Design a binder for this molecule. Structure first.
Ligand SMILES: CCO/N=C/c1ccc(OCC[C@@H](C)CCN2CCN(c3ccncc3)C2=O)cc1
Ligand SMILES: CCO/N=C/c1ccc(OCC[C@@H](C)CCN2CCN(c3ccncc3)C2=O)cc1
Ligand SMILES: N[C@@H](CCC(=O)N[C@@H](CS)C(=O)NCC(=O)O)C(=O)O
Lengths: 235, 263, 59, 235, 263, 68, 68
């Protein structure tokens, strides 16, 4: 036979689970000072760089998503007894929905918002999501603004907006809490989120990133000397 | 066998346009500009035929030994060109393709090479520690365009930051090596073979129609791949000219005129 | 990766006769190079790259 | 009926899981001095001798592989409390991919490298791999070098290479870490890897090894008197 | 029923050649040498017909009462034989089969037995604590070949290690009992019955074509199974000769000549 | 540039190559070289040769002629 | 490569003599008693539009030269 290009397809190139978020949640006795009883994470893939760099090969994309959650817990001390198995609640809050202000407020009723209840020690949680883009395709790069200043504006701040930003709040957030009450001993936990694109279509290929990322945009600050030395007539 | 109902759960020469005439061409992605089809829309569009689809010539620039490059944004560069700009500012939604013609003439004793690149969603980097802090006025120079630089000059102002781009020639102003810029639609003008370049750009965007004021669909970048020289003269300068023709332009959402504040 | 058991070969360039120019003409010039793959090119065994790194997660 | 040779086939002869690696990983508070927070093992079957001896009956082979992982954990002390169930991460690093320098560096994002997350107390992990040989068959024995010294070489080290070695880095490595943070009490763990060939074809049978192995090659150092005494005319 | 898509997941007389003539044969694995087929390749090969496929005679050796054995490597032994060596050193890739003829004549009053073995991928053991430290020059003696030993003599040099093989006769130089060496293609020369041996070796390797300089495909081992004797004389010596003919040889990758450094 | 194709010419079908030369190549300047009004001018001339349809017979040990 | 100037008078070569040390062709030439071959000759010389001159290339069978 002859060599094939089965593994160079777009689907195969993105058929891997890539970490996109590490989130910390703690269980302990509530106190006046700041605590990590519940956490909120803004959904995106730009926190990490590997999946971001792989996706930025193209200007436009359209795909469904698969999310997997891995939870790891540990103690902090030894003289405050032990704890029983904990249950974690993960809730998806789309834009416009109320956001929690405490680990036990009414917002956790999740009457309409989807939620996942995970029991520690079981298999990592998993879900799937379809394409939820307002337009016909996701826009990795956007060359424009959300507002245009006008001569008749009273002040310059009316039309001021960040460059290369479509919407301030996009795709909602994920809120993670520990449903169990506090044991006499504090327990810390980390949730790792892994993302896998599926049914992927792409448009307008672009050259890959060559210098370290700096912010959500295309800005560069340091390490602008990627290539190394080599002789002109040296093999 | 698929169990869940939802699919997501499933496991994976002379060219004449209008009243203008110019005397090989490159078609981007092999797609000619076309109007919106009946199977994709969101009122009655306004589709000028000859009052806007014609060649407009921008200001000439000068290329010398120390020149590093130039860049323009579309449809920003044509915001003040005849009735095209009026229709752009009188309508909420606009759409159009482009034809770009770059002219530069020299003699047989000159030498040099220019690379012209058309980039969709061409985003440039800033000149400050703050991220995405560039202003609208600085990001839309107009027909004058901007220039590239060989080094990153961080802005030291703390009271009145400039809020301007700082493109770098060898990084293409976006953090990618220039050598790979040929992945985009491109043309090369070599003084020993040719003296002009032509490109045809269709409408590219995630939406069928979008606002022209707050979003730029295309970017044009011209860079000297080889330095200019002539005989043994110390200083050499030659003119470079750019002409742009809109094609298959549609407008919708008629209302009062928009008046952006450019400084 | 670099490996002597899968070495590919060497590429070299030389002058055949020389560069000849007339008077009132530049005596130095520049040359450019490009590379590409043909239609009989294939790859195997997807893996991570060494061209991108990260030191601190966003706060 | 008549006696059959069903169990003497090549497939049956190799239809057994054989241990090929024991790897140690520890979880404790990081310190300046050396530690075993993460481990890297170079993939091969020559660490053990039984499977090596069985495979060396032939000169060339071609097969797919099945790998199984068994994890066993234990404590070391008693006065530092206890720990919660741990999660182990196993990542395959092919040649040329970046290698970790710490237990929590970016390399663990595994954007493109396959990875396994194992929860302690569950069934032993398992995976399958196809034939990934560059040539048409694996070469158990190689009589040659990777470099040839030349008269024009500046020094003798340019063309120096080990005898009977094709490539320095072949088949990549496996990196194993404990995802969980450190509990106040240290916890040690061992991972045992068992390999089973499948769909096996072999060529050029060879006599089996008769003296103890010494190194990856065919060298012998000690115990060169295998046969025992026996009388010529003694039954 | 198979669930996963991948298969791996599925549960398990005169002989004349060229201008040479020699006056029963053994074919290794019952496979005659043949050229590469159209359904397996990786340019135009060079296939000499008569300029390289002919009998070359090596240096004669002497067999006595204290002789322990001899060994040669192919295609190493023919690196300096006419145009075959030139083609070997002028091309990156080579392929060939072989015909081996061993000659040894004696009288009816002599007695002895020689065993000749052809071994694919014949790897030998070193003579030092360091592993795989043998040098290229020592591993490619050439047409002179090497000799076996009855004991393992560890090298005591620490400043200038010899880096040489130390084969052992009863271990076949590779840690396997000699009695099982008959599993390989083999011939026996018994002075009371015959005086010559012939073997035909096809090309064997994990790849269709491979370099001949850095890799040896075959090894030839000759050992005395029974000691030589004659009447009641104290000392006896007889000559042993080896001839080798390449067959169906192909070469590819023409370029400048290779010049290995042999001491 | 110039190109010529030479077939095998001789009174015999095949002949020794060492003691007999079949062809000669002669290059001569029909007109002198000049450039503008410069006193000295030099340019390179290169020659390339490709054998075609070559046959050999009479294999034996190698010949080693004594060239000085 | 050779150099052509104002005082150059000409050059000559003999075939198959000129190729006696060219790869395997020379080896086959010296390892065989009888040989046969044709040739393709390519002469390269580049100049500018402001140069002038003319070269004549001649292929001669049985090219015998005079002594001194
Ligand atoms: C009960 C909890 O389960 N709910 C989970 C869930 C997960 C993901 C959901 O969608 C989040 C948006 C994703 C489809 C990915 C959004 N992408 C695609 C384009 N994009 C992006 C980001 C920055 N610049 C350009 C594009 C993104 O970040 C919705 C619900
Ligand atoms: C997420 C982790 O899962 N990834 C696992 C995995 C396992 C095995 C993989 O392949 C490793 C190579 C194997 C197919 C066996 C290699 N063999 C076959 C021939 N060979 C060998 C060794 C020394 N001398 C000669 C041959 C070997 O060691 C790749 C990925
Ligand atoms: N060591 C750091 C955290 C390391 C970290 O978050 N690394 C990121 C990228 S820089 C990562 O990919 N971690 C993978 C993981 O450990 O799960 C700290 O705690 O100060």
């Amino acid at each position: 036979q002859r060599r094939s290009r089965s593994e160079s397809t777009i689907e195969s190139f993105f058929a891997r689970g890539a970490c996109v978020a590490i989130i910390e949640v703690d269980n302990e006795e509530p106190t006046t000072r700041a605590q990590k009883l519940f956490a909120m994470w803004r959904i995106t893939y730009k926190d990490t760089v590997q999946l971001r760099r792989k996706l930025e090969f193209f200007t436009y994309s359209r795909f469904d998503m698969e999310l997997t959650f891995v939870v790891t817990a540990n103690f902090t001390n030894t003289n405050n007894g032990h704890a029983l198995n904990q249950v974690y609640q993960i809730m998806y809050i789309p834009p416009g929905a109320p956001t929690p202000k405490s680990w036990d407020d009414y917002t956790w009723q999740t009457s309409s918002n989807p939620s996942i209840f995970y029991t520690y020690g079981a298999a990592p949680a998993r879900i799937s999501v379809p394409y939820v883009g307002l337009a016909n395709a996701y826009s990795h790069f956007y060359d424009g603004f959300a507002k245009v200043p006008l001569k008749t504006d009273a002040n310059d701040q009316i039309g001021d907006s960040l460059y290369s930003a479509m919407t301030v709040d996009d795709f909602g957030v994920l809120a993670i809490r520990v449903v169990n009450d506090h044991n006499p001993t504090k327990v810390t936990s980390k949730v790792r989120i892994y993302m896998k694109p599926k049914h992927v279509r792409v448009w307008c290929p672009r050259p890959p990133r060559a210098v370290p990322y700096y912010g959500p945009g295309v800005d560069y600050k340091d390490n602008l000397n990627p290539l190394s030395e080599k002789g002109l007539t040296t093999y | 066998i698929n169990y869940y109902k939802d699919s997501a759960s499933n496991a994976a020469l002379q060219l004449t346009i209008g009243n203008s005439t110019i005397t090989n061409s490159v078609v981007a992605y092999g797609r000619w500009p076309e109007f919106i089809r009946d199977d994709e829309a969101n009122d009655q569009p306004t589709e000028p035929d000859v009052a806007t689809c014609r060649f407009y010539t921008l200001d000439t620039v000068m290329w010398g030994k120390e020149s590093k490059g130039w860049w323009w944004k579309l449809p920003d560069a044509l915001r003040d060109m005849g009735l095209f700009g009026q229709n752009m500012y009188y309508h909420y939604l606009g759409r159009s393709g482009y034809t770009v013609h770059v002219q530069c003439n020299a003699s047989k004793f000159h030498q040099g090479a220019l690379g012209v690149f058309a980039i969709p969603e061409y985003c440039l980097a800033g000149d400050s520690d703050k991220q995405r802090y560039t202003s609208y006025a600085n990001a839309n120079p107009g027909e004058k365009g901007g220039k590239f630089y060989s080094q990153f000059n961080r802005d030291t102002a703390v009271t009145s930051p400039k809020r301007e781009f700082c493109p770098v020639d060898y990084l293409l102003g976006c953090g990618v090596l220039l050598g790979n810029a040929f992945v985009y639609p491109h043309q090369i003008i070599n003084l020993r073979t040719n003296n002009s370049a032509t490109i045809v750009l269709p409408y590219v965007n995630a939406m069928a129609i979008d606002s022209m004021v707050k979003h730029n669909n295309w970017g044009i970048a011209i860079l000297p791949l080889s330095p200019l020289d002539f005989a043994q003269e110390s200083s050499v300068e030659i003119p470079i000219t750019v002409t742009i023709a809109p094609m298959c332009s549609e407008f919708n959402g008629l209302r009062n005129v928009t008046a952006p504040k450019f400084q | 990766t670099q490996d002597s058991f899968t070495e590919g070969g060497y590429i070299s360039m030389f002058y055949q006769t020389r560069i000849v120019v007339p008077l009132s003409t530049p005596k130095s010039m520049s040359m450019l190079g490009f590379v590409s793959a043909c239609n009989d090119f294939s790859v195997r065994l997807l893996r991570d790259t060494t061209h991108i790194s990260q030191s601190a997660l966003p706060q």
